[PDB]
Design a protein around this ligand. Sequence first.
Ligand SMILES: Cc1cc2nc3c(=O)[nH]c(=O)nc-3n(C[C@H](O)[C@H](O)[C@H](O)COP(=O)(O)O)c2cc1C
Ligand SMILES: Cc1cc2nc3c(=O)[nH]c(=O)nc-3n(C[C@H](O)[C@H](O)[C@H](O)COP(=O)(O)O)c2cc1C
Lengths: 125, 125
Amino acid sequence: MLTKKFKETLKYEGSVSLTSWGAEKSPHVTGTWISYLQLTSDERILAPAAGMHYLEEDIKVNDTIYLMLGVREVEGKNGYQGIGFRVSAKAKLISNGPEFEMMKEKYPFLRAVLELTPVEVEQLL
Amino acid sequence: MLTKKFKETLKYEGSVSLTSWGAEKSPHVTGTWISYLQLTSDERILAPAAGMHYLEEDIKVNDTIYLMLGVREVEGKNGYQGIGFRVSAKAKLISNGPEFEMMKEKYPFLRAVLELTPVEVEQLL
Ligand SMILES: Cc1cc2nc3c(=O)[nH]c(=O)nc-3n(C[C@H](O)[C@H](O)[C@H](O)COP(=O)(O)O)c2cc1C
Ligand SMILES: Cc1cc2nc3c(=O)[nH]c(=O)nc-3n(C[C@H](O)[C@H](O)[C@H](O)COP(=O)(O)O)c2cc1C
């Protein structure tokens, strides 16, 4: 599901966009940092949730989000310097357990872990 | 509308996400680079559109979009290394005129210019 190139991107830094929708007429966009993402052995993507109020209300209605990220330092299609990804994922927020404990240690500011289950990965460059 | 800090971020490179909706069902997320963004004297934000076919279909119905970007290298609020913005904008695709011409010189791959009129700017860190 998560290619070698996707995994390579996660070694750099950049803005991650999280698009959610369903609780209001318009969608919401929430950010995180590539360096805050943690890959699990079953290739779930975890991020520290500090605020993410709107995204939480959206995913109570529609648990599908879009993640977008891109870095200049990874070679895209046709040697193009730069790569981007659009990931469709199912979202839930985790408030306890060993992964929460592991993330709470790295990111003391978090109230919950955002757990993303990738359902589709599109490499865009 | 566009602050000193926002203008400072546009010196760096990173992923820009553009969230659009209306052409029906779920939102779309499209990307560009901070290095492809150009500010006009009246503080419109221009980007080269090579693809953006689904955003194009959304804005015919709902011309409001959400741009998100962030860079680690800029100091945010309080004791924070990094800055992010969410910009709400009215969007239009431009096919000719002097701005098309200037963007086409810089970005010869574009078919059209995405013109964003900022209606709200939120500093998120
Ligand atoms: C690049 C970037 C990184 C961010 N990282 C996080 C983060 O890891 N966790 C978080 O809770 N908010 C983060 N934010 C802020 C979120 O976008 C969001 O505004 C905040 O969680 C409050 O969202 P809300 O208005 O829906 O409550 C980040 C913003 C940007 C632009
Ligand atoms: C970091 C990043 C930068 C991108 N830059 C552009 C760009 O400047 N113009 C563009 O048309 N597509 C760009 N793309 C790809 C778009 O997201 C989009 O998929 C593409 O235009 C193909 O048409 P579509 O929008 O209908 O999918 C970029 C992707 C990423 C991840």
